[PDB]
RNA sequence: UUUGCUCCACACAAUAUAGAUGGAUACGAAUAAGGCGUCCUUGUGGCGUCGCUGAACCAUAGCAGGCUAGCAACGGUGCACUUGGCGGAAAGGCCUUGGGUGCUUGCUGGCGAAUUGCAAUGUCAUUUUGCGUGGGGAUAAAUCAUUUGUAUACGACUUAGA
RNA sequence: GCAGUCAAGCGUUAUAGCGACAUUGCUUUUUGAUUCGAUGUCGGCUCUUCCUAUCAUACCGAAGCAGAAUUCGGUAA
RNA sequence: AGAACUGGCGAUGCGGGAUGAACCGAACGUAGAGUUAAGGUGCCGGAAUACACGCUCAUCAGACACCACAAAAGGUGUUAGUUCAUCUAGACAGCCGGACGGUGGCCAUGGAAGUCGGAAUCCGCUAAGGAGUGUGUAACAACUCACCGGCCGAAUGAACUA
RNA sequence: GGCCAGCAUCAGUUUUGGUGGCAGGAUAAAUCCAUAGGAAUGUAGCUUGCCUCGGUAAGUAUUAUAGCCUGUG
């Protein structure tokens, strides 16, 4: 229903989010994923770190520059999960993959855009309470990603600006609702309520 | 078995106030305030009156109800800390080399400095955790006293002080030097 | 101000007399009352005023409402109907924003094309008045 | 899984069952027929040599101990359940460690014996301290100054962990001898003692308290009445 | 499937000089009458020395629950097959019908004991008239006076792929 | 933190076919040994069933009735 | 290298291909908790209210939207200027001041529409390394060849020369 | 290995038969005394990497571990 | 390993089991429409991130052949059962108290008092208490536990099965 | 009349809805109504202990100022 769908990746499970995003891209929807460092993986941090270190074990023996390439950033971990669910060696798979962008944090112009969530991929809706889960920024920092603090500082500045914007928007919303409430007793309002609006 | 409801009770004395919101407990008493984050456990707190606070788990299993009893014990420890305090008395003994224990300030950080442990030239430094006080006992030979409202902080500081003087590569049936916790109790000794 | 404060976190309770709204099945969208608890997942419900048969149902097929009325446990259909009428459950349900939202949704679904045109005209008139009142202050 | 495992012992004495309680029940009910006066005795924290000396002194009478609930069931708990008339009052007067003295002797003789009987006893916890005790400075001896240290024996080195940990007395080991750097106050006269102080007094062997057998009341077979005696019940 | 309860009454075939043989009745839980008749012949061969070729089905009638809208506690005595022998089991099920209790029991046996319909024998399903005779804790905890319990962490199903609000689990 | 090699769980065709042959041979041998060997070949009422007394009374009454029914 | 290169307004001419056809419509955090409104002694505060999906909200009527007449109001919105402020994560966007010039379906009128023939996407949205009108702006380097040896199999590299 | 013994179990109502853990005898007997038939493939040099089933180096646990030295063991390539 | 019967395959493509001589389905003219088999329906990938009742958390779980590793072995993981017992004349934990007398039983020992050893292991009084369950002493002492009682007040323990 | 289409009325095959009349069973079982018994996860009332002005704990009390279960019709 929208030309570009922006998904706030915070609090989502990586596999289910990857599955839904891959199907959307193959169906032809343009998707931008923000805040990839706030993604979640079910299972404890040592388990997920062990899995990543097994992936790190994988490498071409006679030339390491030819082997599987291990990308440490959270956005690249999510991109690996997505590319595993797209048939990426065909032209159709490449075209589907080029309808996707993944970012750490929320850079411009997406910091002023509406961001949605995916209910079937949400941790609080999917995992049973008490089950342990891992956070992608911490996993990436443990396996060698080196921009965790910079993203945190930029995100804090973005949150300050966004809070100021929301305060102004909420004041305007209160004024609009106050103006709309005093017209609710008029004949036009009664006719609209009769028609359902 | 999935017990429908399991609950524990927490008793609050006269001078203690408890504020719990979203599993952030603040306990205020005559000796000061303590704060605990319990957001890793799914429990529900309810206030019955100013003296009784219930903590409950709904539709929970064995691990969940074990966590419930643990939560009750932790809040009881916080209450005891703000009303009586905790006091750990340690003793340090030696065979030949007198152990020298001092309180030093390293950029205003309150370290405990241990010298001449078994004749070592190394200076052992144990930081003093915030909220605990270190006093050298009067008319008791070679006794240290750690006091505070947090039993966790006091006991961990005592354990760090005890572990900083591990005897290495010597028969410990023979080499008896060290710093040992000799007593645990409360700061208040009115009765 | 030397008294403890603990957040209540008030849940709706599965209990006898709790009014539920059936969200799927033959009786979808109808009100019923919980008469007896079978286990953690199933209850016995009875909906005599709205025409819901007395039946055992899973708690995942209903949504609990904030409404509750006094009812004996295991009360038969006649007793449930009498207590429901005495407590006036239907009026208190219809006075809530939840039921008003359901009614508005049904009305909007029932609107015709001519009525949608009339809605647009009335919305433009109300918009003119609201914007004028908003600019003056 | 994850349950506590019971410790296993290999000893000779096995637990008593309901048959022992039934035997005690029948013995009490038969002594109720056999004897004239049934006296209820409070004998809490009694030592076995003292109790056996009492039994030896009361040759010809029957002293029966046991669980107080068993004794009250033998006597009859309520008015419709009493074994004899006006025995429920005697049964409900039983409290604590209760013994039953069935006898045919005189009321005056029983009162005189239980007024004039007394023995030296350990100072029990939650009681009154009979003396002020102070362990002297230097080498700690077995009596702790209650006798001259020239005649006394030094305390064994094996008790130093108990004194330091359980008794919380600051002690050191010097050449195999227990030593305290300062004199130590154990108890003050006319003060309530706790478990730790009572244990210290018992360890040093000081026994200045008095044991007296309390008597609550008695029942007569022919009169079918209960009279409060109130002996050593201050 | 969803079980029904039948009565199956059968007998040996009448013969000369042995007329009017005895009639034997069983209460059978089964999804349909074909399964009910098969189970009847199985149990009749296991108990008596009566074969399907030697006998006939006199009657089969569905038995309905007497009060299907009344909550009841059921004690279910069952017997299952093992290589060492046949072992008893007693379960307690709270439900509004005998067929509902039997279906719950079959599902529980398949979940826990890894058991099947052909191996599970229903020996007795008996309603507990008085609550004092209930002796399973998972059933007794629901017999408390004024029973109230909440449902924390409600998970709402979404009809759309994307949601424009962060969800809440309040109830 | 040196992770070791994980055992593969990909199915080998030769291993699976060999396991099939091994299992068939095992079944034949077990059947043969069960036929050849020599070895000599009611739990009652569960204690938790509430109407134990009723079941026992019914079975006793049926036994006593059948005692005289088959005799005369 | 027959006036080359490059931005601003004005007419023509073509142009919009992983798939426009009303609008991607901006708090953060928690979920065994929150959002909003309000009051006070401003807090882990009291009270009220909301959820149970965006099935929303905003826009949306006029020859693909024409030509005119009025009533009410001083609002809404488009375009070109202009005042000031903020934004560097990839800012390239966000907010705002004042005047001008259009439209306004908030309300009531008067004309026009046809024949695309009973449907045929029935063509409607930004950017234009192409032309002709015109006002201002600026007049380079690299390679070969020669040369050095901090370099070198050859290329390459590193120096120097109006 | 062979031949037994015991019995926690399994089996049974015929006190048959299987049987874990233990255990005995032979090989092997008392004063630390005093090379025997590989019937067909093997070693080097240079140089790389892997495994851990660790010899050394690191950190630990136990031991009549006083000290010194050593033995057994844990994590560890 | 040897006999007897019957299938499959070679001469045979097609659907499924990721892949394939003997596995599941089904045998073949060229096409259209419909329905299915076996196998499946998160994404690759056509098809329910269906419904329902339970179980499981694995410092490389499992999604498998049902053979082996496998001793139906080990585990203070978790769930459901079976059989025994104890229990308001008071269940299990916990604290306190009692835990005696002949007697320091006999022999042996430099010493040996229940506790280095060898043989007796009895009697009394008991509510109960071993000629002693362990720590300990050079021997004693002291503590313990076997057993009993007081306080507490409602279910508990053991062994098996899955 | 060659090429490509749209609609209507039909035929053959098929897929997906709405709705009507019947018939069986314990001539469904239930709900509901009446009647006779009964009990607790004991409703009203009564008594007592002592509590915030009557809200509780324990005895009684089988429909009363709530109800439920079973049999029969
Ligand atoms: Mg017009
Ligand atoms: Mg190793
Ligand atoms: Mg698909
Ligand atoms: Mg192997
Ligand atoms: Mg047709």
């Amino acid at each position: 229903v929208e030309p570009v769908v922006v998904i706030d990746g915070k609090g989502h499970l990586v596999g289910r989010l990857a599955s839904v995003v891959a199907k959307q891209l193959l169906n032809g929807q343009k998707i931008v994923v923000v805040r990839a460092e706030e993604l979640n993986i079910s299972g404890e941090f040592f388990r997920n770190k062990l899995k990543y270190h097994d992936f790190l074990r994988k490498a071409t023996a006679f030339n390491k520059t030819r082997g599987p390439f291990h990308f440490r950033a959270p956005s690249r971990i999510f991109y690996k999960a997505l590319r595993g669910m797209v048939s990426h060696k065909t032209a159709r798979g490449k075209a589907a993959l080029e309808r996707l962008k993944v970012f750490e944090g929320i850079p411009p112009p997406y910091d002023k855009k509406k961001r949605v969530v995916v209910p079937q991929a949400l941790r609080v809706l999917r995992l049973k309470p008490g089950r342990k889960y891992t956070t992608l920024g911490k996993l990436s920092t443990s396996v060698g990603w080196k921009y965790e603090d910079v993203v945190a500082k930029l995100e804090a500045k973005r949150k300050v600006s966004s809070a100021e914007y929301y305060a102004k928007k909420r004041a305007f919303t209160k004024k609009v609702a106050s103006a709309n409430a005093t017209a609710a007793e008029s004949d036009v309002a009664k006719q609209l309520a009769a028609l359902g609006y | 078995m999935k017990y429908i409801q399991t609950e524990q009770q927490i008793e609050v004395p006269e001078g203690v106030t408890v504020s719990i919101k979203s599993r952030i407990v603040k306990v205020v008493g005559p000796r000061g305030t303590l704060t605990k984050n319990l957001k890793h456990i799914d429990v529900t707190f309810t206030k019955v009156n100013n003296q009784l606070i219930k903590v409950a788990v709904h539709n929970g299993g064995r691990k969940h109800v074990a966590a419930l009893r643990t939560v009750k014990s932790l809040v009881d420890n916080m209450i005891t800390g703000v009303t009586k305090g905790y006091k750990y008395k340690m003793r340090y003994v030696y065979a030949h080399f007198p152990i020298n224990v001092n309180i030093v300030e390293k950029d205003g950080a309150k370290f405990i400095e241990v010298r001449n442990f078994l004749g070592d030239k190394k200076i052992r430094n144990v930081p003093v955790r915030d909220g605990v006080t270190i006093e050298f006992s009067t008319n008791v030979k070679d006794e240290i006293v750690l006091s505070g409202n947090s039993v966790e902080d006091v006991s961990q500081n005592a354990a760090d002080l005890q572990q900083i003087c591990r005897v290495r590569n010597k028969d410990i049936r023979k080499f008896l030097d060290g710093i040992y916790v000799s007593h645990k109790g409360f700061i208040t000794e009115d009765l | 101000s030397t008294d403890s404060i603990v957040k209540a976190s008030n849940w709706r309770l599965v209990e006898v007399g709790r009014v539920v709204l059936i969200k799927k099945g033959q009786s979808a969208g109808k009100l019923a009352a919980i008469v007896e608890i079978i286990d953690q997942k199933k209850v016995l419900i009875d909906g005599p005023k709205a025409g819901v048969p007395r039946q055992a149902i899973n708690l995942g097929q209903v949504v609990l409402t904030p409404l509750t009325f006094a009812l004996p446990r295991g009360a038969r259909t006649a007793t449930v109907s009498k207590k429901w009428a005495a407590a006036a459950v239907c009026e208190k349900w219809a006075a809530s924003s939840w039921a008003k939202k359901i009614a508005q949704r049904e009305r909007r679904a029932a609107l015709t094309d001519f009525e949608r045109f009339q809605v647009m005209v009335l919305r433009k008139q109300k918009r003119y008045t609201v914007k004028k009142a908003l600019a003056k202050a | 899984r994850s349950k506590r495992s019971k410790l296993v012992t290999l000893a000779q004495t096995d637990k008593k069952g309901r048959e022992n309680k039934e035997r005690i029940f029948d013995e009490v009910r038969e002594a109720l027929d056999t004897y004239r006066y049934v006296w209820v005795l409070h004998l809490d924290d009694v030592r076995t040599p003292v109790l056996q000396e009492i039994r030896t002194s009361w040759a010809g009478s029957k002293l029966i101990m046991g669980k107080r609930k068993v004794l009250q069931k033998a006597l009859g708990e309520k008015r419709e359940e009493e074994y004899k008339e006006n025995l429920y009052q005697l049964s409900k007067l039983c409290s604590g460690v209760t013994g039953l003295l069935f006898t045919d002797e005189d009321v005056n003789t029983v009162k005189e014996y239980f007024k004039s009987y007394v023995r030296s006893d350990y100072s029990r916890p939650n009681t009154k301290a009979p003396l002020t005790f102070t362990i002297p400075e230097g080498i700690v001896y077995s009596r702790g100054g209650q006798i001259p240290a020239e005649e006394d024996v030094p305390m064994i080195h094996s008790l130093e962990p108990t004194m330091r940990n359980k008794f919380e007395i600051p002690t050191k080991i010097k050449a195999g001898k227990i030593t305290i750097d300062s004199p130590y106050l154990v108890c003050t006269e006319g003060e309530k003692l706790d478990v730790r102080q009572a244990l210290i007094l018992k360890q040093f062997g000081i026994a200045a308290s008095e044991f007296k057998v309390k008597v609550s009341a008695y029942y007569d077979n022919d009169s079918s009445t209960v009279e409060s005696t109130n002996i050593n019940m201050e | 499937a969803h079980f029904k309860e039948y009565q199956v009454i059968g007998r040996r075939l009448p013969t000369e000089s042995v007329p009017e043989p005895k009639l034997f009745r069983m209460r059978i839980f089964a999804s349909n009458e074909v399964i009910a008749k098969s189970r009847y012949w199985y149990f009749l061969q296991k108990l008596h020395k009566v074969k399907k070729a030697s006998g006939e089905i006199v009657s089969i009638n569905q038995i309905n629950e007497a009060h299907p809208t009344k909550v009841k506690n059921f004690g279910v005595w069952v017997r299952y097959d093992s290589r060492s022998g046949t072992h008893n089991m007693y379960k307690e099920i709270r439900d509004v019908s005998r067929v509902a209790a039997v279906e719950t029991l079959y599902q529980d046996m398949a979940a826990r004991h890894r058991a099947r319909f052909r191996s599970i024998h229903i020996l007795k399903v008996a309603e507990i008239e008085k609550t004092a005779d209930v002796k399973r804790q998972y059933v007794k905890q629901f017999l408390t006076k004024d029973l109230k319990f909440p449902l924390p962490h409600r998970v709402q199903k979404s009809t759309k792929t994307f949601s424009y609000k962060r969800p809440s689990t309040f109830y | 933190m040196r992770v070791r090699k994980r055992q593969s769980r990909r199915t080998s065709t030769k291993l699976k076919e060999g396991i099939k042959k091994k299992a068939s041979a095992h079944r034949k041998k077990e059947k043969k040994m069960a036929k050849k060997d020599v070895t000599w070949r009611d739990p009652g009422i569960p204690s938790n069933f509430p109407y134990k007394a009723k079941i026992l009374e019914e079975i006793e009454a049926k036994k006593m009735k059948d005692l005289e029914e088959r005799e005369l």
Side-chain angles (χ1 to χ4, degrees), chain D residues 1-6 9-11 13-16 18 20-24 45-46 48-49 52 55 63-70 73 124 156-158 202-203:
Chain D
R1 321 292 278 282
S2 200
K3 62 180 182 61
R4 178 183 182 178
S5 177
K6 306 177 65 62
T9 65
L10 296 186
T13 315
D14 300 315
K15 289 186 181 181
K16 277 75 201 170
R18 194 189 170 84
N20 209 74
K21 284 186 297 189
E22 291 166 359
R23 180 190 62 83
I24 297 171
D45 302 325
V46 62
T48 307
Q52 287 167 346
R55 292 178 185 268
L63 178 73
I64 307 185
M65 316 275 299
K67 272 183 177 182
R68 188 178 55 88
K69 308 291 288 197
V70 184
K73 203 76 190 307
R124 304 303 184 176
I156 188 59
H157 65 93
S158 307
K202 187 177 187 173
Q203 188 72 44

Side-chain angles (χ1 to χ4, degrees), chain D residues 65-118:
Chain D
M65 316 275 299
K67 272 183 177 182
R68 188 178 55 88
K69 308 291 288 197
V70 184
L71 299 174
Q72 291 190 195
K73 203 76 190 307
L75 290 180
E77 169 63 28
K78 293 187 60 178
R79 301 197 66 250
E80 72 280 7
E81 307 158 14
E82 58 189 329
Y83 199 56
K84 291 184 176 181
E85 199 272 339
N86 280 341
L87 203 51
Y88 59 94
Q89 289 124 352
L90 186 78
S91 186
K92 73 177 178 62
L93 279 175
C94 308
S95 173
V97 179
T98 303
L100 296 184
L101 182 58
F102 304 88
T103 189
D104 300 315
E105 297 268 325
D106 303 320
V107 180
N108 293 349
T109 55
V110 178
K111 289 184 174 190
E112 174 61 35
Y113 183 83
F114 284 134
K115 283 180 180 180
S116 299
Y117 187 81
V118 69

Side-chain angles (χ1 to χ4, degrees), chain D residues 11-209:
Chain D
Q12 314 297 327
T13 315
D14 300 315
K15 289 186 181 181
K16 277 75 201 170
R18 194 189 170 84
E19 49 273 49
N20 209 74
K21 284 186 297 189
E22 291 166 359
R23 180 190 62 83
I24 297 171
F25 189 97
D26 295 330
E27 285 192 8
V28 176
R29 286 212 164 179
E30 287 189 341
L32 269 167
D33 294 322
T34 323
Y35 297 87
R36 170 167 184 174
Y37 301 97
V38 191
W39 298 80
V40 280
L41 308 172
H42 298 242
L43 280 150
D44 303 23
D45 302 325
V46 62
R47 299 197 316 267
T48 307
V50 181
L51 193 69
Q52 287 167 346
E53 179 176 349
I54 294 162
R55 292 178 185 268
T56 307
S57 299
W58 282 103
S61 302
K62 276 293 297 297
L63 178 73
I64 307 185
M65 316 275 299
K67 272 183 177 182
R68 188 178 55 88
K69 308 291 288 197
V70 184
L71 299 174
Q72 291 190 195
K73 203 76 190 307
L75 290 180
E77 169 63 28
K78 293 187 60 178
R79 301 197 66 250
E80 72 280 7
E81 307 158 14
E82 58 189 329
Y83 199 56
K84 291 184 176 181
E85 199 272 339
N86 280 341
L87 203 51
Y88 59 94
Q89 289 124 352
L90 186 78
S91 186
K92 73 177 178 62
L93 279 175
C94 308
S95 173
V97 179
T98 303
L100 296 184
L101 182 58
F102 304 88
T103 189
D104 300 315
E105 297 268 325
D106 303 320
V107 180
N108 293 349
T109 55
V110 178
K111 289 184 174 190
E112 174 61 35
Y113 183 83
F114 284 134
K115 283 180 180 180
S116 299
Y117 187 81
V118 69
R119 287 294 175 278
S120 65
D121 193 26
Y122 288 139
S123 195
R124 304 303 184 176
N126 299 120
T127 58
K128 204 61 64 184
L131 83 165
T132 292
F133 181 43
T134 291
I135 319 177
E137 190 259 3
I139 304 180
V140 178
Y141 286 80
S142 63
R143 272 298 190 96
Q146 290 295 128
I147 57 178
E150 299 81 15
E151 178 188 335
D152 203 354
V153 181
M155 186 103 68
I156 188 59
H157 65 93
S158 307
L159 283 172
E160 205 272 338
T162 293
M163 299 183 70
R164 193 182 64 249
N165 300 332
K166 199 189 208 301
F167 294 161
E168 305 182 354
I169 306 175
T171 54
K172 286 83 180 171
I173 311 185
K174 288 185 176 58
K177 295 178 174 182
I178 304 181
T179 313
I180 54 178
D181 282 330
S182 62
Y184 181 82
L185 176 65
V186 170
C187 54
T188 316
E189 189 178 339
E191 197 192 23
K192 191 177 308 304
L193 303 179
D194 55 358
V195 172
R196 195 188 64 90
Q197 289 158 1
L199 280 166
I200 293 177
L201 290 177
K202 187 177 187 173
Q203 188 72 44
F204 283 102
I206 316 172
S209 300

Side-chain angles (χ1 to χ4, degrees), chain B residues 74-107:
Chain B
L74 293 181
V75 182
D76 288 341
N77 278 10
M78 272 187 297
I79 290 180
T80 297
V82 305
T83 192
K84 297 182 194 176
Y86 294 94
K87 189 176 188 175
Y88 277 41
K89 289 180 176 300
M90 306 188 68
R91 283 183 48 178
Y92 53 95
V93 293
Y94 45 86
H96 174 265
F97 293 102
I99 303 173
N100 194 15
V101 188
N102 294 97
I103 296 297
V104 298
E105 303 291 337
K106 177 177 179 53
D107 297 329

